[PDB]
Amino acid sequence: SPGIWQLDCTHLEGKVILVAVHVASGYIEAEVIPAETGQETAYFLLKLAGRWPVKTVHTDNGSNFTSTTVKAACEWAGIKQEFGSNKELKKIIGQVRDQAEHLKTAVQMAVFIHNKKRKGGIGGYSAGERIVDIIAT
């Protein structure tokens, strides 16, 4: 559906990367949070939903179900939190890592290349075009 996302956390250089995947497009947004805090996750979701239709977020564990601020964010923005690979991100992060002082910069460079690039280098739509194409329809 046009509003279905997947939310997962990954780890690099002792910091936390929050990753949202639009499941139908493979479009990603990500942020480095100082710790695995609710506030930061609530803030990330509010930003995401102001930008894209975000109707249902799927997570794989209990963490997001125990944050009072994530719950208030879900309600304010009208996001259903439901219970129940894309770390080629980390390969791209290694390719750029030394073009950037900060990890957060290298993550955003990785997200930029993930979203802009064509599948297998050539022809048809990038993840960033697919999400616009899906939402346009």
- Tokens 């930008």 label which residue? 51
128 binds, among a second copy, ligand XFS, none (CB under 5 to 8 A by kind): a second copy
- Is 39 one of the binding residues for ligand XFS (CB under 6 A)? yes
Q: How far is the CB of 123 from ligand XFS (least distance, A)?
A: 28
In the window 50-79, what residues touch a second copy (CB under 8 A)? 50-51, 76-77
- Is 49 one of the binding residues for a second copy (CB under 8 A)? yes
How far is Cα of residue 21 from the mean position of the Cα atoms in its chain? 5
User: Looking at 6-14, 45-53, 60-68, 86-94, which segment touches a second copy (CB under 8 A)?
Assistant: 45-53
- Residues 41, 33: contact at Cβ < 8 Å? yes
- Is 91 one of the binding residues for a second copy (CB under 8 A)? no
Q: How far is the CB of 115 from ligand XFS (least distance, A)?
A: 15
40 binds, among a second copy, ligand XFS, none (CB under 5 to 8 A by kind): ligand XFS
- Residues 86, 7: contact at Cβ < 8 Å? no
The torsion angles phi and psi of 39, rounded to 5 degrees, stand at -40, -50
The span from the CA of 78 to the CA of 120, in Å, is: 36
Binding mask 78-107 for ligand XFS (x = CB under 6 A): ----------------------xxx--x--
- Is 108 one of the binding residues for a second copy (CB under 8 A)? yes
Give the residue, chosen from 12, 43, 56, 96, that forms a contact with ligand XFS under the rule CB under 6 A: 43
